[PDB]
Amino acid sequence: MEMEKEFEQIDKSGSWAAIYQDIRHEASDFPSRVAKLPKNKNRNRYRDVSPFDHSRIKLHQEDNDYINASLIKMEEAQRSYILTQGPLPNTVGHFWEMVWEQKSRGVVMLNRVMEKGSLKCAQYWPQKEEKEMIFEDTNLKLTLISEDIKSYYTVRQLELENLTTQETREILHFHYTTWPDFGVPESPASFLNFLFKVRESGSLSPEHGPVVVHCSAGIGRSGTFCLADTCLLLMDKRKDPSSVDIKKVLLEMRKFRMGLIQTADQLRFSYLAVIEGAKFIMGD
């Protein structure tokens, strides 16, 4: 069923809450035993959001290999993503260790450091060229190279140095700064423009490790980003684009991380973004 007609059907009948609860009921449940070990309690932002054991990213250290991060591997679309929580005061060094070890080119941030008067993640990158950051627990140095501030997003060029080997790499930071404190955006136009800027940079392409994407919990806004990207790519690849079923793609992604898409409003917004984005994919 053409999702656009499915969309109007759900909208006229006002059944978004019912659709979303069906997804929650059918979603996978896999163990997350490592996330729940007592030694890891200060590595998790939220008690109820954990990576599954089978898909979690492992840090390359014998001490404690745990980080709240999951590998979403989309086999038909030939795309992979790492979805993670906003870094905590005690995990900023782990976060950059993961970016280094997984050979990522880009980091996608969908939240502000402070929202609703409260801290939603650590200030984990440097704000001035001449004031670099050193992460002593993981032996990394991070320097701000340049910053481009636009009306709906900011793009930063960063230099990450492995102090053990003195190798350096360029990391691109894509920061969507205008998601509202409550609800979802009224129009998907600026979110789609942002997605296309990330694509154009190479950060989503197979010559690099997976993009790292996060918000505060790494499931809601972050889930919207990867769901929209994968659905638009599948519409490009298939003979019949109307065969792409967004609910089925979402359930596939929930095999790899729990809770993706947190509200019925986020589900509706994801539909809107794919419907409007397809009016470029099919040619427009």
CB 232 within 8 A of CB 278: yes
Which residue of the set 121, 215, 226, 231 is catalytic? Answer: 215
CA distance 280 to 159: 34
Q: Find the angle CA(46)-CA(52)-CA(57) to the nearest 5 degrees.
A: 90
Looking at the DSSP bridge assignments, the partners of residue 94 are none
How would you list the strands of the sheet with 153-162, edge to edge?
56-58, 66-74, 79-84, 211-214, 106-109, 167-176, 153-162, 140-149, 133-135
CA distance 169 to 172: 10
Check the annotation: does 219 bind a ligand: yes
Amino acid at residue number 92: V
Q: At what angle do helices 16-26 and 246-253 cross, to 10 degrees?
A: 40
For residue 207, which of 19, 112, 79, 117 has the smallest C-alpha distance? 79
Amino acid at residue number 200: E
* Paired tokens of 211: 């993009």
Check the annotation: does 218 bind a ligand: yes
CA 191, distance to chain mean position in Å, is 13
What technique determined this structure?
Answer: X-ray
Residue identified by tokens 């449940």 is 29
Provide the sign of the torsion angle of the four alpha carbons 214, 220, 221, 222, taken in this order.
positive
Residue identified by tokens 């490790």 is 209
Question: Does 226 participate in catalysis according to the annotation?
Answer: no
Check the annotation: does 231 bind a ligand: no
CB 249 within 8 A of CB 231: yes
- Provide the residue ranges of all domains of the chain, joining segments of one domain with +: 1-284
Half-sphere exposure of 145 (CA within 13 A, CB side): 15
Check the annotation: does 146 bind a ligand: no
**How big, in percent rounded to 5, are the helix, strand and coil portions of the chain?**
35, 25, 40
